[PDB]
Scaffold this motif. Structure first.
Motif, PDB file in Angstrom:
ATOM      1  N   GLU A  18       0.818  -1.208   0.000  1.00 25.88           N
ATOM      2  CA  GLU A  18       0.000   0.000   0.000  1.00 25.88           C
ATOM      3  C   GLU A  18       0.854   1.261   0.000  1.00 25.88           C
ATOM      4  O   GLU A  18       0.457   2.286  -0.571  1.00 25.88           O
ATOM      5  N   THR A  19       2.009   1.218   0.659  1.00 28.66           N
ATOM      6  CA  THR A  19       2.862   2.398   0.722  1.00 28.66           C
ATOM      7  C   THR A  19       3.378   2.745  -0.669  1.00 28.66           C
ATOM      8  O   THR A  19       3.313   3.899  -1.108  1.00 28.66           O
ATOM      9  N   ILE A  20       3.875   1.740  -1.389  1.00 30.61           N
ATOM     10  CA  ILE A  20       4.273   1.952  -2.770  1.00 30.61           C
ATOM     11  C   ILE A  20       3.078   2.451  -3.590  1.00 30.61           C
ATOM     12  O   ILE A  20       3.171   3.438  -4.337  1.00 30.61           O
ATOM     13  N   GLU A  21       1.926   1.810  -3.432  1.00 28.33           N
ATOM     14  CA  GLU A  21       0.784   2.168  -4.271  1.00 28.33           C
ATOM     15  C   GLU A  21       0.253   3.558  -3.969  1.00 28.33           C
ATOM     16  O   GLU A  21      -0.448   4.134  -4.810  1.00 28.33           O
ATOM     17  N   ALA A  22       0.548   4.098  -2.793  1.00 27.73           N
ATOM     18  CA  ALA A  22       0.217   5.479  -2.490  1.00 27.73           C
ATOM     19  C   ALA A  22       1.262   6.450  -3.014  1.00 27.73           C
ATOM     20  O   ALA A  22       1.135   7.653  -2.778  1.00 27.73           O
ATOM     21  N   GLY A  23       2.311   5.962  -3.671  1.00 27.27           N
ATOM     22  CA  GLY A  23       3.296   6.841  -4.266  1.00 27.27           C
ATOM     23  C   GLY A  23       4.548   7.081  -3.450  1.00 27.27           C
ATOM     24  O   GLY A  23       5.358   7.933  -3.831  1.00 27.27           O
ATOM     25  N   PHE A  24       4.757   6.350  -2.356  1.00 24.31           N
ATOM     26  CA  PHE A  24       5.994   6.439  -1.596  1.00 24.31           C
ATOM     27  C   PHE A  24       6.830   5.203  -1.908  1.00 24.31           C
ATOM     28  O   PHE A  24       6.391   4.074  -1.648  1.00 24.31           O
ATOM     29  N   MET A  25       8.015   5.408  -2.490  1.00 28.27           N
ATOM     30  CA  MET A  25       8.779   4.280  -3.030  1.00 28.27           C
ATOM     31  C   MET A  25      10.249   4.658  -3.177  1.00 28.27           C
ATOM     32  O   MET A  25      10.610   5.841  -3.195  1.00 28.27           O
ATOM     33  N   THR A  26      11.090   3.631  -3.313  1.00 34.61           N
ATOM     34  CA  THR A  26      12.511   3.841  -3.550  1.00 34.61           C
ATOM     35  C   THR A  26      12.778   4.041  -5.049  1.00 34.61           C
ATOM     36  O   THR A  26      11.921   3.805  -5.907  1.00 34.61           O
ATOM     37  N   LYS A  27      14.009   4.446  -5.358  1.00 32.04           N
ATOM     38  CA  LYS A  27      14.323   4.970  -6.680  1.00 32.04           C
ATOM     39  C   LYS A  27      14.176   3.917  -7.763  1.00 32.04           C
ATOM     40  O   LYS A  27      13.769   4.235  -8.886  1.00 32.04           O
ATOM     41  N   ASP A  28      14.486   2.659  -7.458  1.00 30.30           N
ATOM     42  CA  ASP A  28      14.268   1.600  -8.446  1.00 30.30           C
ATOM     43  C   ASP A  28      12.812   1.559  -8.898  1.00 30.30           C
ATOM     44  O   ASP A  28      12.527   1.375 -10.088  1.00 30.30           O
TER      45      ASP A  28
END
Ligand SMILES: NC(=O)C1=CN([C@@H]2O[C@H](COP(=O)(O)OP(=O)(O)OC[C@H]3O[C@@H](n4cnc5c(N)ncnc54)[C@H](OP(=O)(O)O)[C@@H]3O)[C@@H](O)[C@H]2O)C=CC1
Ligand SMILES: NC(=O)C1=CN([C@@H]2O[C@H](COP(=O)(O)OP(=O)(O)OC[C@H]3O[C@@H](n4cnc5c(N)ncnc54)[C@H](OP(=O)(O)O)[C@@H]3O)[C@@H](O)[C@H]2O)C=CC1
Lengths: 398, 397
Positions: A349-359
């Motif tokens: 969910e964190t990635i899907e909310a737009g918070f993610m690492t550079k890869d």
């Protein structure tokens, strides 16, 4: 207070993953779960100092306590022998552990709705397991220097007549030839691991072979899987509305590029930060979970020079959550099982909310057009996971 | 019209059969006259001739050096029933490749407005593997119980025999097998690859796993280099292209990090965009085709009178690859120009935003395509035909 988690064997590792591993324990696991932790340090320096004994002890521990979670380790080569002034070129810890445990390795990419995939229709992942080729396996290959016969023979121990197969008559020129083998017992272990994997995830299971070409070699995989299924798993599979089916490797690659995903694919034969691994032993009781990637040396060097890094922890976090979810399954520990699920959902969910690492930002924007404001560094991302985890677990208590 | 020379053509089945006739009618025949050797490899005709037409087609390609083939049904049990076939005829492609030999090279056509796997790919990647005929089999068998499996090499004169233990089965049975490669097949592979990298002006890479199979894969590496250093490294450096061996692990790496533009010889977007070419060892004979099937699901819609949108690009490039090769063998400059012009028109049309539904779905995502984003099979052929007329007209003045 915290969840009582039971016995978990943990293996510390090297370089960038060692750094992320300790953050995961400190920020995501230890605040919520108490463990009877059997912790082994497989860092390259400790493996060297103990003459690799720590690696064999960890393997024995996993065998005894059924659940292992492993951090990526340096497999030494000649350059590493120089870098660390090693006593010997120690064998890979994964090789040593696998040889002691047996089992089959299943790889699974973690899917996020906003991260482009190969097949756009793949909603659920594909869990691929390859027949383990082991470390004491060895095909027998040699150069054929010139004209002559190559034959492969079988001589029964029971004294009955020897069998001779012509491989090829080289009438002009030379070439190469080789022999290969597989024991029934390895194939059985492969089938059992695959059936248990499918039963655990609740997905159907496909075995692909080339039994149209290698009618005897691949026919044996096909037959052994079928015999074990009908006799030991079919009723269990039906109880969960799943099935097992053999498929020609061609019909398989089609069926998958047009499928929604959500199945186990055994065969004989995307960011690495999102690829999980799990060693599933044939007993159905023992597993070892790890990230499918290595120690991320390139990032580690940047970290040593004090530069900012953005290393994806997802694969490492899922090593913990798969390990803890299996422990919850063995112990019938509902609270631990919810925790492991919740942490997986928070990560995705964190990635899907737009918070993610550079890869991952580069997957979305293209490497040429990623900006610093598109992604979080390693520590900001762990901090965001930690805060979202706290929120998720307070919502669960309502 | 252009005088095109001898082309062997093979007609096929279902949706590709319809596209194939549209290509001839709208894109080829208005500009090129061919001494056309046409073989009908439709499933009904193969059944009626007991698959003889397939064997005659292979011989014709052997004789005339250029084949262009439409996709064909490979019978399975359901096809036997569907068509009341006398037999489960073997794949026509198997039969033809067995008679011709050679190396199969696959290549996606690239349109800059179509998303690719690696967004960095802007030049083609051409992958070759060797077509080892049906006589290239492994020898596999069941091992019913404990015992020893050995593999032995006995030189023709009887001396210098060697026996290698493959495995001692101590606790049960299992399976075993032997396999081989002749130097001649590896040399054929190497020659087809070096001459593809020259025909196209790209670097050639061979990949192996010679870290495990030290001897087996070492032989491919050693023979490729030997054939290079002695027969091609000169002409290679003349085109600023190189040859290089690489481990599969490495190759896969450098491949994604690069922008494409190489031949990748392998030692083992949309299908409507994937081309295939069989390149024979002789350097003279070529068989071109689409790298997809007959598109049955689209044909079923067409049979119900439903609009379809089937990509003809791969089938068109089977024609242009074939005709370009024919032009090369005959030093036919008008033909060579035509074949290249048709490829440019095809890419240009799509890059101008005129495309079939499969490509529109790559861009918009399938749930998002609207009818106005694509052309149906027949509209797309007409657009290509119109752009081809313009392209060739402007080239005259
Ligand atoms: N199971 C294990 O213990 C494993 C051990 N190793 C060990 O790992 C060390 C390095 O191996 P290496 O060859 O560098 O392969 P790695 O997988 O360790 O890293 C390779 C590259 O893949 C990308 N990558 C991998 N994981 C991540 C991640 N979590 N987040 C972001 N990017 C990632 C990076 O690419 P970029 O450079 O583009 O950022 C990274 O440099 C070696 O010593 C090797 O022995 C390797 C295999 C498995
Ligand atoms: N060389 C040959 O002669 C070949 C023979 N075949 C034969 O083809 C028949 C059907 O094979 P099938 O399994 O359907 O695989 P196909 O490649 O024929 O079609 C498969 C799917 O891929 C997509 N597709 C393929 N080609 C195109 C195209 N030109 N334009 C747009 N979309 C395309 C469609 O997907 P969607 O459904 O998503 O629109 C189509 O349904 C079988 O009888 C098989 O034997 C298959 C392979 C090669």
């Amino acid at each position: 207070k915290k969840i009582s988690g039971g016995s978990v064997v943990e293996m510390q590792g090297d370089e960038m993953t060692r750094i992320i591993w300790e953050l995961i324990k400190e920020k995501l696991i230890f605040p919520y779960v108490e463990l009877d932790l059997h912790s082994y340090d497989l860092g390259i320096e400790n493996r060297d100092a103990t003459n690799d004994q720590v690696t064999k002890d960890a393997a024995e521990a996993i065998k005894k306590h059924n659940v292992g979670v492993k951090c990526a380790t340096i497999t030494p080569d000649e350059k590493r022998v120089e870098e660390f002034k090693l006593k010997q070129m120690w064998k890979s810890p994964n090789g040593t552990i696998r040889n002691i445990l047996g089992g089959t390795v299943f790889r699974e990419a973690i899917i996020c709705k906003n991260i482009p995939r190969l097949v756009s229709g793949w909603v659920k992942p594909i869990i691929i397991g390859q027949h383990a080729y082991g470390d004491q396996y060895r095909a027998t290959d040699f150069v054929v220097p010139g004209p002559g016969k190559v034959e492969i023979t079988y001589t029964p121990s029971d004294g009955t007549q020897k069998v001779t197969y012509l491989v090829h008559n080289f009438e002009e020129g030379g070439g190469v030839a080789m022999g290969m083998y597989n024991q029934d017992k390895s194939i059985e272990d492969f089938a059992h691991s695959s059936f248990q994997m499918a039963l655990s995830k609740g997905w159907p299971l496909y075995l692909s072979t080339k039994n149209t070409i290698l009618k005897k070699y691949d026919g044996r995989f096909k037959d052994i899987f079928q015999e074990i299924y009908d006799k030991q798993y079919k009723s269990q599979f039906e109880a969960q509305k799943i099935w097992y089916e053999h498929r020609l490797i061609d019909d398989m690659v089609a069926q998958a590029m047009k499928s929604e995903g959500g199945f186990i694919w055994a065969c004989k034969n995307g960011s690495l930060g999102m690829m999980t691994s799990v060693l599933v032993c044939p007993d159905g009781k023992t597993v070892e979970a790890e990230a499918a990637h290595g120690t991320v040396t390139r990032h580690y060097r940047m970290y040593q020079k004090g530069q900012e890094t953005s290393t994806n922890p997802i694969a490492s976090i899922f090593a913990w959550t798969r390990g803890l979810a299996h422990r919850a399954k063995l112990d019938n520990n509902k609270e631990l099982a919810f925790f492991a699920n919740a942490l997986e959902e928070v990560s995705i969910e964190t990635i899907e909310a737009g918070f993610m690492t550079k890869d991952l930002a580069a997957c979305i924007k293209g490497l040429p057009n990623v900006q610093r404001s598109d992604y979080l560094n390693t520590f900001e991302f762990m901090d965001k996971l930690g805060e979202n985890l706290k929120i998720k677990l307070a919502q669960a208590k309502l």
